[PDB]
Design a protein around this ligand. Structure first.
Ligand SMILES: [Cl-]
Ligand SMILES: [Cl-]
Ligand SMILES: [Cl-]
Ligand SMILES: [Cl-]
Ligand SMILES: [Cl-]
Ligand SMILES: [Cl-]
Ligand SMILES: [Cl-]
Ligand SMILES: [Cl-]
Ligand SMILES: [Cl-]
Ligand SMILES: [Cl-]
Ligand SMILES: [Cl-]
Ligand SMILES: [Cl-]
Ligand SMILES: [Cl-]
Ligand SMILES: [Mg+2]
Ligand SMILES: [Mg+2]
Length: 303
């Protein structure tokens, strides 16, 4: 392993939360929070499974930043999922960044990467069934860019230095399907790619990527809905109307989620009825580095 991992979270045990803290190596540019928003009450309004989510954030040996957001389907497979990401996905990231620099069409480079990941999964990790988005930075033409993709229900948003929030990877929903890295979706990888998210964008130091496995659904908006041959596909974005330009997006998302979750739990308790809703909740932050930090990380990777 030549990449530098500054934050990692392999699930969290039921009933617990995880807050990573900052890592001094990348000057507090990366953090993870992991918990569960699952609520299950009896009729008293009294409370009644571990997380399958994983986030990895770090830098290649070339100092390029990456974030990987993963959501495993099934609790009995979670170690197969977490091992697959370590053993097969992470070693691809450095060459992905180099191929984005070296080839003219980022869309072809990313489609090739997605095909490779399904092939490795088939050959080496049949029990790793999971949705995933990822992104990496790369340098071209004396500027910095970020490219990646998501298949399934994880998302990646970006808060730009000037304060604008944009979606890079949307949460995709397809009627009657759960598109994913799994045996079933591998039958038509190119159709799966076409209806999910691939992106390529210029970034500046201080732009802030926020990856997440889940948010309470009233906090998303529908960016686009379209039909495929007949199923409806929905692209769901974090709704920027809940945010402002001052604090980091990671800070504001945790605050807006926690306020919404206290409202949901209060409503659920007061109904005098069984209630069950919510899911595992894992959030990663990655601030795009400046050149000085990129150079420091390259040195650290060598020594
Ligand atoms: Cl590695
Ligand atoms: Cl660590
Ligand atoms: Cl913990
Ligand atoms: Cl399960
Ligand atoms: Cl392969
Ligand atoms: Cl093989
Ligand atoms: Cl095998
Ligand atoms: Cl496996
Ligand atoms: Cl480009
Ligand atoms: Cl397969
Ligand atoms: Cl296909
Ligand atoms: Cl909505
Ligand atoms: Cl810079
Ligand atoms: Mg899920
Ligand atoms: Mg899951």
């Amino acid at each position: 392993m030549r990449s530098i991992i500054t934050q990692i979270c392999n699930g969290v045990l039921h009933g617990q939360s995880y807050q990573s803290g900052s890592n001094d190596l990348d000057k507090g540019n990366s953090e993870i929070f992991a918990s569960s928003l699952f609520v299950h009450l009896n009729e008293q309004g009294k409370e009644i499974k571990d997380s399958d989510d994983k986030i990895v954030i770090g830098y290649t040996k070339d100092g390029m930043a990456f974030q990987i957001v993963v959501d495993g389907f099934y609790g009995c497979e979670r170690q197969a999922v977490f091992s697959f990401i370590d053993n097969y996905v992470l070693p691809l990231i450095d060459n992905f960044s180099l191929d984005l620099t070296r080839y003219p069409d980022s869309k072809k480079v990313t489609e090739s990467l997605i095909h490779t990941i399904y092939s490795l999964r088939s050959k080496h990790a049949p029990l790793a069934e999971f949705t995933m988005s990822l992104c990496v930075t790369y340098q071209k033409d004396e500027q910095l860019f970020c490219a990646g993709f998501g298949i399934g229900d994880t998302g990646i948003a970006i808060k730009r230095n000037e304060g604008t929030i944009e979606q890079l990877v949307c949460h995709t929903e397809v009627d009657g399907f759960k598109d994913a890295f799994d045996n079933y979706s591998s039958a038509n990888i190119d159709l799966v790619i076409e209806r999910n998210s691939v992106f390529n964008t210029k970034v500046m130091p201080g732009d802030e990527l926020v990856g997440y496995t889940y948010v309470p659904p009233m906090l998303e908006m529908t960016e686009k809905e379209f039909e495929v041959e007949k199923r409806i596909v929905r692209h769901l974005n974090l709704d920027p109307g809940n945010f402002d330009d001052k604090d980091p997006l990671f800070s504001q998302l945790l605050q807006v989620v926690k306020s919404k979750q206290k409202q949901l739990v209060e409503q659920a308790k007061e109904t005098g009825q069984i209630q069950r809703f919510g899911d595992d909740f894992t959030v990663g932050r990655l601030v795009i580095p400046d050149q000085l930090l990129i150079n420091q990380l390259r040195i650290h990777a060598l020594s």
